[PDB]
Design a protein around this ligand. Structure first.
Ligand SMILES: CCCCCCCCCCCCCCCCCC(=O)OC[C@H](COP(=O)([O-])OCC(O)COP(=O)([O-])OC[C@@H](COC(=O)CCCCCCCCCCCCCCCCC)OC(=O)CCCCCCCCCCCCCCCCC)OC(=O)CCCCCCCCCCCCCCCCC
Ligand SMILES: CCCCCCCCCCCCCCCCCC(=O)OC[C@H](COP(=O)([O-])OCC(O)COP(=O)([O-])OC[C@@H](COC(=O)CCCCCCCCCCCCCCCCC)OC(=O)CCCCCCCCCCCCCCCCC)OC(=O)CCCCCCCCCCCCCCCCC
Ligand SMILES: CCCCCCCCCCCCCCCCCC(=O)OC[C@H](COP(=O)([O-])OC[C@H](O)COP(=O)([O-])OC[C@H](COC(=O)CCCCCCCCCCCCCCCCC)OC(=O)CCCCCCCCCCCCCCCCC)OC(=O)CCCCCCCCCCCCCCCCC
Ligand SMILES: CCCCCCCCCCCCCCCCCC(=O)OC[C@H](COP(=O)([O-])OCC[N+](C)(C)C)OC(=O)CCCCCCCCCCCCCCCCC
Ligand SMILES: CCCCCCCCCCCCCCCCCC(=O)OC[C@H](COP(=O)([O-])OCC[N+](C)(C)C)OC(=O)CCCCCCCCCCCCCCCCC
Ligand SMILES: CCCCCCCCCCCCCCCCCC(=O)OC[C@H](COP(=O)([O-])OCC[N+](C)(C)C)OC(=O)CCCCCCCCCCCCCCCCC
Ligand SMILES: CCCCCCCCCCCCCCCCCC(=O)OC[C@H](COP(=O)(O)OCCN)OC(=O)CCCCCCCCCCCCCCCCC
Ligand SMILES: CCCCCCCCCCCCCCCCCC(=O)OC[C@H](COP(=O)(O)OCCN)OC(=O)CCCCCCCCCCCCCCCCC
Ligand SMILES: CCCCCCCCCCCCCCCCCC(=O)OC[C@H](COP(=O)(O)OCCN)OC(=O)CCCCCCCCCCCCCCCCC
Lengths: 331, 459, 120, 31, 63, 65, 50, 100, 171
């Protein structure tokens, strides 16, 4: 118990430490990108220990370590959830991010703002691990909006370009359309189950869950670029190749899929929500893979590839296989 | 509350006896000392308000507005000392005296135990604000803006005077502490309908209500920077404060008097936000965004649930800091390009990177990025309005699209793109300006660590 | 209103029964505000004649303060007297007319039914 | 900038239309 | 911009480092109070109902 | 540019005439949606209140409001 | 004093603070008389608050 | 022609006469001391000591107390078999209903 | 620590480590490294800090509010009594809020602790949660933002009139 929770919080605090280093600076750096790459590699190594001792016993816990705010019946706490989804996704995300940053030390070498770029990429990683480890909907919304804003700042990296700013504002627009449904779901759970924590949502086990699941499906449509709210992910290729490689292929865009996987005890008892996810995912994975057949920009083709795979993930959530969908994320 | 009134009055001999190079430094120093002293008002209790005397009291609603009011004066002195550098010395002291007088009127507006003294201070705040707009505003339309700011407010407030004197003659008192215990239910009659309108329409104008907001995109625009800071950050919030004091007496008629006005805000925050998509004037965009944000506070006060009042007072404090910082950013560009047209100076992140970081932070707080208290107030209002009626999330969520879409457009048009070629007087960011941006943004970010102090009397 | 009271003893600024009242203190905050009005009149009198405002004619400023405190002291005495006469007439009229001012039977809230209006 | 270069009311006479077109820096046939 | 950030961090740390050192020395050496039942006939002061010494000092000095 | 901003901002009311077109567009776009959302939210809250005071709405864990 | 102008606002606090304390003694009608906080006075105690 | 008017004065640059200017005043000593006053009494005093004061508020609005007090009452009524909370806030013996 | 009666945990049954393979797992070696490198120096530092605590022992107290008369036995428009009734009612309302929070923490901790069989093994916490939410809803719901003991008494009297009418029609 004392090993697991300690190294769990060490991973997150260790990822936050180069943000304090880049904000508390005076000098021109002795290779700050190597520092952030070494930091994320060691955070991967540190996060492998709770993963392995999850593989040994299935050991899950919840670190509700800081009481934040009690709104009369809603005790909001800094509450981290170390279950199967965190224990598998956090090493995969850290490993991919370590590869993207050692790639970025080569690719972004001519950029005179490389420290700002590594700062932003690490801020994305911090907000994504706030998203995937959260226990209440407020903290998951913090990570949700955080990866959205780092998506904005990293699409619109070369900000003298009109199309980069246009693509970034487009990504913000579609993700706020998803945020309509996310805040719908938060409103439903607060008014009907008196909670944002996942535990009380799972334990009360509501039956009339059509409207909060429609809100979660709208949030996943915005975040995982499903049909109707898809084109921001092909527009998002206007950012640099480490941004499209880390965020908009593998790590950010699975957060809506991860949101619907995270609510699997509610989607497993709602056939209408499963049919909506199934039809929406099949529509998206048809449409984007059909669009990819005739494109000529290589990053557009791989962006339609990753949106077709997200549509496949939404399909396999829709057939009541959330763990195969999460396995397909990690794969 | 006399331990804050007397230092604010001693700011008058402090500014009228200072040396001619010293009247900004001394007033800034001692107004920061008054703002440090303001934290003693956080002696709040879970049941009893901090009741000082027969005349003054402070609950957990008035206390954050008092701290924000006493904090806003040094920031206004920093914002306003550049464009009044060539000003005459005695007119400079008159400007500082009007700001000091406005702080004095506000800090005993929020702590007025009795409601007609609340009214006298509430309408006493017009005169320094009117004089600041019409005397130190820059353009021709400051006079018309002063006329609109005066005459929407008085046409709203004089029926409030009649209604408060009626409550005095009927209930026997206008002590709020007495009226917590002697409040009688207000039944359905036409007499009580106009009682409700006379008690509410003054604060509806001061919030502003959509449809009555027309004074604001002149009064916030034609004012100087200290005028825009105090109008956006404090003087709109007198309406919400007075509504939260006056809707105690207006039950249960409010439960069917609120229906038009709720519509006027729930559609109006869609309209004014949409108006911010097509504003060419940056300062007018910030004004219409202030109307858009205060419409949620109007809805949250009219639906009168605990989550709604908590989100409304959080959103009032958060919008005070955010809109004050946005006007200071707009002034920091106006002091360079001498035009409030937003399309004129573009690409400013290439020229001013740290100031563009401040633009980014104030934009993110404008679009309610969690866990900022902008998002806390926004979110609690959305929760309470969903519990009010489930359909309202549409008008909430659509609002949260457009609120993003003008906040980053303001970030993209001013800071991103190619810089303007023919503009070459873009000086580097002064230390006073970055100090001003940090003294707005750093309390707004530190309040996310302990938001319970800005969540009103029923946290 | 009270014009029939001060009609048997007319044009009396402070009657003899006013000497039954506690006079205002010299540290009365109303009297200190009237002295501040005298000081403001002294400063405006220096300003309109283009004198140095705080320095010129301290004898004149001090006579302004003295004259306003002197007039305002008697004005506060008469103010306290007229409110004392107001309350004396009120209490004597309530005492002489009990049939118009009955003691209301105060019911505790266990009997007092109030209609609950739900906010939802 | 001054008064006669600001936008004004709708032109009805052809000389007012020509003065408006000269104000907006464009041809009368294109205005 | 560098001069502003240097002066900003300087004047924050100028009192932040003594405040952090002081809070650490209060928590270590002075230490936090302990919950106890009230003795019979003992009337506590209003600052004796709080756990941290800085909160007790604030409730005794100012509130 | 100054001419464009003055036409977009200050020239609008001195070149306005109240006629048939502007009155129908101001009634259609100004009070129309207010009437629409009024009847929508009013019908919704009447239905919800009628369900609540008849003991029909599932309000089992709803204690935050 | 060469910097007598820097005591106008602080003493104006302290004097104001003084008056608030002087105000509280004029609002002491229910000192140790409330139904919630009334008690017997301790030895060498004459008032329960000031 | 038009009247006797002073022309539009040019905008001053504070960096020309003082490249070390903090933008407070054109006198460099007044400028640097205004900088020090703003930075000390704003950041070193109000922000740092203010956040320290707010961080150690003595149980702001008695929430922590109300936790601990609740931990008394539940422990009193888990032990004595009582329900955790009554649906009636006040005793139904001390309430008179209007008869019908 | 806390009271195990107000915050209940059942006894923990961990199984004995029964290795089948001959490969030594890294978890035991890392647990020994966490004991040597981490747990013992933190233990020594906390022992030092606790000795510095024990050099100056002092106490704080839990405030006891004696019961004043409630709103039912206050005369109407008598502020000196109904003030005390209202303050007592606000403190009772805040304590009932914290009671509901304690039962929510019990329910969520039971759900995480029982894991996959939580729907079977947390029926008691769910039932206590349902009872205390029902009681809190009957006591304080829909009072408004301007709630009082008068509003709460009026809601209770309306509920008692409805219950008396429902009892009379069922007889
Ligand atoms: C106090 C309040 C009243 C002061 C009136 C006189 C003010 C004055 O002359 O100031 C100049 C004088 C300095 O001037 P100077 O250098 O000697 O010579 C004149 C200049 O050359 C001036 O240069 P100039 O005149 O050549 O040109 C500049 C021009 C600049 O003017 C312009 O350009 C035009 C105006 C600009 C726009 C308008 C700005 C605002 C001005 C009006 C205020 C409106 C708001 C007021 C409240 C709202 C209601 C309307 O005019 C002035 O500056 C004229 C001077 C007056 C300025 C201040 C006006 C105050 C009077 C009005 C407000 C107070 C009364 C009404 C209050 C209502 C209820 C609250 O200022 C002071 O000395 C201020 C006082 C500081 C010391 C205070 C000490 C207190 C001691 C207390 C203890 C002792 C007494 C104990 C009493 C109790 C005994 C029991
Ligand atoms: C150091 C410099 C820091 C920076 C300085 C400058 C800072 C800037 C200016 C700030 C100005 C003040 C502002 C206002 C704040 C005032 C302080 C306050 O309110 O404190 C509140 C709060 C409560 O303080 P309290 O009420 O005074 O104490 C309550 C206790 O009941 C009573 O306390 P206690 O008696 O129980 O505890 C005593 C404690 C004294 O307490 C303190 O020092 C706490 C006060 C410090 C507060 C600092 C706040 C400033 C911000 C710091 C964080 C940011 C820094 C920069 C960025 C870093 C990277 C993030 O003693 C110690 O610390 C000594 C133990 C050391 C253990 C570690 C080493 C053990 C092994 C050693 C082996 C070698 C020797 C062997 C032989 C030995 C022989 C003897 O204190 C803190 O929050 C402390 C900060 C650390 C919190 C936990 C950190 C880890 C959390 C991880 C999970 C959560 C995050 C997950 C993130 C996920 C991704 C995003
Ligand atoms: C009580 C003790 C508290 C201690 C902890 C502090 C708590 C928060 C306080 C305020 C923190 C912000 C202050 C620094 C940033 C503002 C100035 C700036 O941009 O400087 C850049 C500069 C470094 O850049 P550079 O290369 O030198 O030049 C800048 C370039 O020109 C251009 O630069 P650029 O554009 O490339 O980079 C700008 C970049 C822009 O970055 C972004 O836009 C990304 C951020 C947004 C998306 C990601 C985050 C989403 C939310 C999640 C995080 C919060 C929750 C996390 C916890 C787990 C989940 C619950 O900014 C950052 O990355 C800043 C990192 C921290 C961001 C915090 C959130 C701000 C976002 C908007 C509001 C979000 C909701 C409220 C959150 C409040 C949390 C308390 O920073 C400094 O030099 C630091 C100056 C000194 C900072 C003092 C901080 C404390 C102030 C309070 C004093 C009194 C209390 C004592 C505390 C003392 C602590 C040492
Ligand atoms: C390197 C510098 C670090 C510090 C160096 C010096 C100390 C060295 C380390 C030794 C440990 C020091 C003592 C232990 C620390 C204090 C322990 C303690 O009990 O502290 C009191 C408490 C713990 O909680 P608590 O329950 O005791 O009190 C909370 C206060 N009430 C009850 C009023 C609500 O506070 C902290 O520990 C504060 C720090 C928390 C850490 C995480 C902060 C995240 C901030 C995010 C902002 C936005 C969040 C919004 C969303 C939230 C989720 C929904
Ligand atoms: C910003 C511009 C718009 C501002 C709107 C301001 C509010 C709109 C409504 C105000 C009505 C007038 C004040 C009402 C005060 C009510 C006090 C009271 O006790 O009422 C009950 C009393 C009842 O009388 P009573 O209480 O003495 O009688 C005893 C009780 N009964 C009736 C049962 C016997 O109402 C009245 O006497 C009349 C109230 C209506 C007054 C109608 C005239 C004014 C019409 C509206 C004018 C609006 C502003 C005009 C200017 C616009 C800009 C130029
Ligand atoms: C207030 C109304 C008016 C509004 C404007 C006010 C302006 C005037 C300003 C006056 C002074 C300031 C007043 C407000 C102060 C608010 C701050 C405050 O007091 O906080 C108290 C809070 C109180 O938290 P707490 O409630 O848990 O404290 C526990 C209580 N005690 C200490 C008694 C046991 O302090 C903290 O939280 C300190 C914790 C340590 C410091 C923070 C560490 C984490 C923060 C984020 C770090 C980075 C994480 C990763 C991010 C990665 C990049 C994005
Ligand atoms: C333009 C800028 C933006 C707008 C700013 C605000 C200006 C308007 C402010 C007032 C808004 C309207 C008044 C509030 C309506 C609340 C509900 C109501 O009263 O409905 C009207 C009434 C409903 O009928 P009923 O409820 O039966 O009335 C009998 C009461 N004993 O209906 C009727 O009885 C029929 C109509 C009768 C005439 C009413 C006229 C007075 C009210 C409007 C002034
Ligand atoms: C300055 C005030 C100087 C007053 C000097 C004395 C004058 C005097 O003796 O006046 C008598 C008068 C009271 O006489 P009385 O019969 O009550 O008046 C009825 C009026 N309807 O006294 C008064 O009326 C006193 C009030 C007069 C105030 C006038 C200026 C304001
Ligand atoms: C109605 C109508 O047709 O009004 C037209 C009339 C002018 O008629 P005209 O077209 O000039 O002949 O125009 C008028 O008589 C003046 C305007 C008539 C009333 C319009 C009411 C609604 C205005 C918009 C409200 C937005 C909120």
């Amino acid at each position: 118990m004392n090993l697991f929770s300690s190294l769990t919080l060490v991973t997150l605090i260790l990822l936050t430490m180069p943000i304090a280093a880049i904000n508390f600076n005076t000098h021109k750096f002795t290779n700050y990108p190597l520092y952030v790459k070494t930091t994320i590699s060691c955070a991967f190594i540190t996060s492998m220990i709770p993963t392995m001792m999850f593989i040994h016993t299935g050991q899950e816990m919840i670190i509700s370590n800081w009481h934040w705010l009690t709104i009369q019946t809603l005790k909001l706490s800094l509450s981290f959830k170390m279950d199967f989804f965190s224990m598998m996704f956090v090493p995969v995300a850290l490993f991919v991010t370590w590869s993207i940053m050692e790639f970025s030390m080569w690719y972004m070498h001519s950029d005179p703002n490389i420290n700002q770029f590594f700062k932003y990429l690490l801020l994305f990683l911090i907000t994504m691990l706030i998203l995937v480890t959260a226990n209440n909907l407020f903290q998951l919304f913090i990570g949700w909006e955080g990866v959205g804003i780092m998506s904005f700042l990293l699409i619109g990296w070369w900000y003298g370009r009109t199309d980069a700013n246009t693509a970034a504002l487009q990504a913000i627009l579609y993700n706020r359309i998803g945020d309509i449904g996310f805040i719908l779901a938060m409103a439903w759970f607060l008014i009907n189950l008196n909670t944002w924590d996942l535990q009380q949502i799972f334990m009360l086990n509501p039956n009339d869950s059509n409207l909060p699941l429609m809100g979660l499906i709208l949030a996943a449509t915005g975040k995982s670029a499903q049909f109707g709210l898809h084109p921001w992910l092909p527009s998002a290729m206007e950012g640099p190749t480490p941004v499209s490689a880390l965020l908009h292929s593998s790590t950010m865009v699975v957060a809506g899929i991860f949101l619907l996987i995270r609510f699997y005890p509610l989607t497993e008892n709602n056939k209408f929500g499963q049919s909506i996810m199934l039809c929406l995912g099949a529509m998206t994975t048809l449409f984007t893979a059909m669009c990819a057949l005739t494109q000529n920009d290589i990053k557009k083709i791989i962006a339609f590839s990753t949106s077709s795979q997200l549509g496949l993930m939404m399909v396999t959530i829709g057939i009541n296989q959330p763990h195969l969908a999460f396995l397909h994320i990690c794969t | 509350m006399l331990k804050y009134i007397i230092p604010t009055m001693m700011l008058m001999p402090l500014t009228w006896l200072s040396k001619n190079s010293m009247i900004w430094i001394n007033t800034t120093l001692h107004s920061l000392l008054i703002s440090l002293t303001s934290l003693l008002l956080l002696n709040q209790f879970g049941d009893n308000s901090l009741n000082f005397s027969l005349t003054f009291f402070s609950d957990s609603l008035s206390t954050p507005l008092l701290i924000l009011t006493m904090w806003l004066l040094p920031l206004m002195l920093m914002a306003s000392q550049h464009h009044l550098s060539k000003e005459n010395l005695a007119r400079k002291k008159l400007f500082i005296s009007m700001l000091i007088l406005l702080q004095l009127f506000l800090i005993m507006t929020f702590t007025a135990t009795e409601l007609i003294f609340f009214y006298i201070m509430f309408e006493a705040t017009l005169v320094p604000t009117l004089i600041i707009i019409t005397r130190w505003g820059n353009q021709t339309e400051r006079l018309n803006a002063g006329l609109y700011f005066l005459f929407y407010t008085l046409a709203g407030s004089l029926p409030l005077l009649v209604a408060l004197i009626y409550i005095q003659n009927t209930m026997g008192s206008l002590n709020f502490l007495i009226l917590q215990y002697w409040v009688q239910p207000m039944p359905n009659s036409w007499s009580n309908t106009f009682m409700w309108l006379a008690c509410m329409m003054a604060f509806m104008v001061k919030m502003p209500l959509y449809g009555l907001h027309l004074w604001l995109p002149k009064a916030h625009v034609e004012a100087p920077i200290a005028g825009s800071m105090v109008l956006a950050a404090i003087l709109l919030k007198l309406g919400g404060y007075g509504m939260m004091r006056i809707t105690l007496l207006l039950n249960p008629i409010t439960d069917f008097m609120a229906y038009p006005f709720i519509m006027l805000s729930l559609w109006g925050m869609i309209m004014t936000s949409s108006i911010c998509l097509r504003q060419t004037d940056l300062k007018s965009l910030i004004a219409y965004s202030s109307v858009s944000h205060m419409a949620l506070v109007i809805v949250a006060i009219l639906i009168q649930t605990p989550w709604s009042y908590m989100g409304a007072t959080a959103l009032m404090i958060a919008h005070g800091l955010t809109s004050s910082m946005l006007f200071c950013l707009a002034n920091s560009n106006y002091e360079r390009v001498h035009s409030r047209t937003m399309i004129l100076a573009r690409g400013l992140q290439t020229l001013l990177p740290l100031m563009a970081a401040w633009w980014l932070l104030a934009s993110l707080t404008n679009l309610a990025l969690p866990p900022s208290i902008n998002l806390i107030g926004e979110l609690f209002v959305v929760m309470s309005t969903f519990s009010w009626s489930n359909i309202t999330i549409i008008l909430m969520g659509l609002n949260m699209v457009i609120t993003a879409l003008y906040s980053l457009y303001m970030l993209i048009t001013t800071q991103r793109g190619k810089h303007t070629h023919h503009i070459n007087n873009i000086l580097p960011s002064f230390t006073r300006e970055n100090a001003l941006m940090s003294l707005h943004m750093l309390p707004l970010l530190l309040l996310s660590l302990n938001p319970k102090i800005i969540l009103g009397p029923l946290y | 209103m009270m014009t029939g009271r001060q009609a048997r003893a007319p044009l009396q600024f402070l009657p003899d029964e006013a000497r039954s009242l506690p006079p205002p203190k010299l540290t009365d905050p109303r009297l200190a505000y009237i002295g501040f009005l005298g000081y403001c009149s002294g400063l405006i009198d220096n300003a309109i004649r283009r004198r140095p405002v705080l320095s010129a004619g301290l004898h004149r400023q001090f006579l302004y303060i003295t004259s306003f405190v002197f007039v305002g002291y008697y004005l506060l005495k008469r103010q306290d007297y007229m409110y004392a006469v107001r309350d004396h007439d009120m209490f004597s009229y309530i005492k002489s007319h009990p049939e118009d001012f009955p003691e209301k039977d105060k019911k505790t809230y266990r009997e007092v039914f109030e209609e609950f209006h739900p906010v939802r | 900038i001054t008064k006669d270069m600001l936008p004004g009311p709708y032109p009805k006479t052809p000389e007012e239309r020509a003065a408006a077109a000269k104000k907006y820096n464009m041809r009368v046939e294109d205005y | 911009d560098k001069r502003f950030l240097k002066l900003l961090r300087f004047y924050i740390l100028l009192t932040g480092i003594p405040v952090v050192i002081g809070i650490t020395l209060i928590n270590v050496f002075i230490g936090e109070a302990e919950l106890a039942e009230i003795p019979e006939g003992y009337v506590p002061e209003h600052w004796e109902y709080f756990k941290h010494p800085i909160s007790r000092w604030i409730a005794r000095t100012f509130f | 540019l100054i001419r464009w901003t003055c036409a977009r901002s200050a020239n609008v009311y001195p070149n306005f005439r109240p006629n048939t077109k502007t009155s129908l567009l101001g009634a259609l776009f100004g009070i129309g949606p207010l009437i629409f959302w009024y009847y929508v939210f009013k019908t919704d809250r009447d239905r919800k209140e009628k369900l609540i005071q008849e003991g029909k709405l599932d309000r089992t864990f709803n204690i935050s409001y | 004093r060469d910097h007598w102008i820097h005591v106008l606002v602080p003493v104006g606090f302290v004097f104001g603070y003084y008056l608030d304390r002087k105000n509280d003694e004029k609002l002491a009608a229910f000192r140790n008389k409330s139904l919630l906080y009334k008690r017997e006075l301790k030895p060498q105690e004459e008032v329960t608050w000031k | 022609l038009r009247w006797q008017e002073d022309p539009e004065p040019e905008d001053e640059n504070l960096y020309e006469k003082n490249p070390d200017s903090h933008g407070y005043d054109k006198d460099p000593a007044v400028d640097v001391w205004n900088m020090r006053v703003v930075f000390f009494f704003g950041f070193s005093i109000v922000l740092v000591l203010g956040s320290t004061f707010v961080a150690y508020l003595p149980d702001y609005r008695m929430q922590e107390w109300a936790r601990r007090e609740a931990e008394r009452l539940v422990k009193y009524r888990e032990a004595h078999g009582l329900p955790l909370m009554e649906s009636n806030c006040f005793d139904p013996s001390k309430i008179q209903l209007p008869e019908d | 620590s806390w009271d195990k009666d107000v915050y209940p945990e059942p006894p923990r049954r961990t199984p004995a480590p029964s290795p089948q393979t001959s490969l030594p797992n890294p978890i035991t070696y890392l647990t020994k490294a966490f004991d040597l490198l981490v747990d013992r120096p933190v233990t020594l530092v906390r022992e030092f800090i606790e000795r510095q605590h024990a050099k100056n022992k002092y106490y704080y107290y839990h405030r006891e509010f004696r019961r004043v008369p409630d709103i039912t036995e206050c005369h109407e428009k008598d502020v000196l009594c109904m003030f005390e009734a209202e303050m007592q009612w606000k403190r009772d309302y805040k304590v009932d809020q914290e009671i509901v929070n304690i039962i929510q923490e019990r329910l969520k901790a039971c759900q995480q602790r029982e894991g996959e069989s939580h729907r079977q093994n947390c029926a008691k916490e769910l039932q206590q949660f349902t009872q205390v939410v029902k009681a809190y809803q009957d006591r304080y719901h829909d009072l408004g933002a301007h709630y009082s003991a008068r509003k709460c008494l009026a809601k209770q009297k309306q509920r008692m009139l409805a219950e008396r009418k429902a009892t009379k029609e069922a007889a």
